């Protein structure tokens, strides 16, 4: 096991804490509102497990399947604490 660093890795892929303004997850998607889409590493998100990544407005949606809700929660926890 060890210590998971998935939350910080995802936050880094999305451009860092200063780039994230909102976090939401559905059943198949992780929706992250960002201040700057150009700071998001779409390829990095796929390497992290995203089946696909779509830029829609000031948001980036990443398909992490059934894990989406869990990653969302871990991201918020890492951002807050």
Curated annotation (Swiss-Prot):
Induction trigger: Induced by glucose. Expression is positively regulated by the cAMP-CRP complex and negatively regulated by the Mlc transcriptional repressor. Mlc and CRP-cAMP bind independently to the ptsG promoter region, and the action of Mlc is dominant over the cAMP-CRP action. The ptsG transcript is degraded under conditions of glucose-phosphate stress (due to intracellular accumulation of glucose-6-phosphate caused by disruption of glycolytic flux), or in the presence of (toxic) non-metabolizable glucose phosphate analogs due to hybridization with the small RNA sgrS (originally known as ryaA).
Ranges of the Cytoplasmic topological domain: 1-81
Record note on what altering residue 26 to S does: Unable to be phosphorylated and to catalyze the phosphoryl exchange between glucose and glucose 6-phosphate at equilibrium. Remains susceptible to CdiA toxin from E.coli strain 3006. Still allows binding to Mlc
Outcome reported for the amino acid change (mutating residue 29 to A/H): Cannot bind Mlc. Destroys the ability of Cys-26 to be phosphorylated in vitro
Disruption phenotype: Disruption confers resistance to cellular contact-dependent growth inhibition (CDI) CdiA of E.coli strains NC101 and 3006, but not to several other tested CdiA toxins. Disruption confers resistance to cellular contact-dependent growth inhibition (CDI) CdiA-STECO31 of E.coli strain STEC_O31.
Modified residue annotations for Phosphocysteine: 26
Effect of residue 24 to A: Still allows binding to Mlc
Known outcome of mutating residue 61 to A: Decreases Mlc binding. Interaction with Mlc is hardly detectable
Domain annotation PTS EIIB type-1: ranges: 4-81
Subcellular location: Cell inner membrane
Active site: residue positions: 26 (phosphocysteine intermediate)
Function noted in UniProt: The phosphoenolpyruvate-dependent sugar phosphotransferase system (sugar PTS), a major carbohydrate active transport system, catalyzes the phosphorylation of incoming sugar substrates concomitantly with their translocation across the cell membrane. The enzyme II complex composed of PtsG and Crr is involved in glucose transport. Also functions as a chemoreceptor monitoring the environment for changes in sugar concentration and an effector modulating the activity of the transcriptional repressor Mlc. (Microbial infection) Probably transports the toxic C-terminal region of CdiA from E.coli strains NC101 and 3006 across the inner membrane to the cytoplasm, where CdiA degrades specific tRNAs. Toxin transport is strain-specific, mutations in this gene do not confer resistance to several other tested CdiA toxins. Probably also serves as the inner membrane receptor for CdiA-STECO31 from E.coli strain STEC_O31.
Entry remark concerning the domains of this protein: The EIIB domain is phosphorylated by phospho-EIIA on a cysteinyl or histidyl residue, depending on the transported sugar. Then, it transfers the phosphoryl group to the sugar substrate concomitantly with the sugar uptake processed by the EIIC domain. The EIIC domain forms the PTS system translocation channel and contains the specific substrate-binding site.
Record text on subunit structure and interactions: Homodimer. The dephosphorylated form interacts with the Mlc transcriptional repressor. Mlc and the EIIB domain form a complex with the 1:1 stoichiometry.
Protein name: PTS system glucose-specific EIICB component
Gene behind the chain: ptsG
Shown chain mapped onto the complete sequence: 396 to 476 of 477
């Amino acid at each position: 096991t060890g210590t998971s660093e998935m939350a910080p890795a995802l936050v880094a892929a999305f451009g860092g804490k200063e780039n994230i303004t909102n976090l939401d997850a559905c059943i198949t998607r992780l929706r992250v509102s960002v201040a700057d889409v150009s700071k998001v590493d779409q390829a990095g998100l796929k390497k992290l497990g995203a089946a696909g990544v779509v830029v829609a407005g000031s948001g980036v949606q990443a398909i992490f399947g059934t894990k989406s809700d869990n990653l969302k929660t871990e991201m918020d926890e890492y951002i807050r604490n």
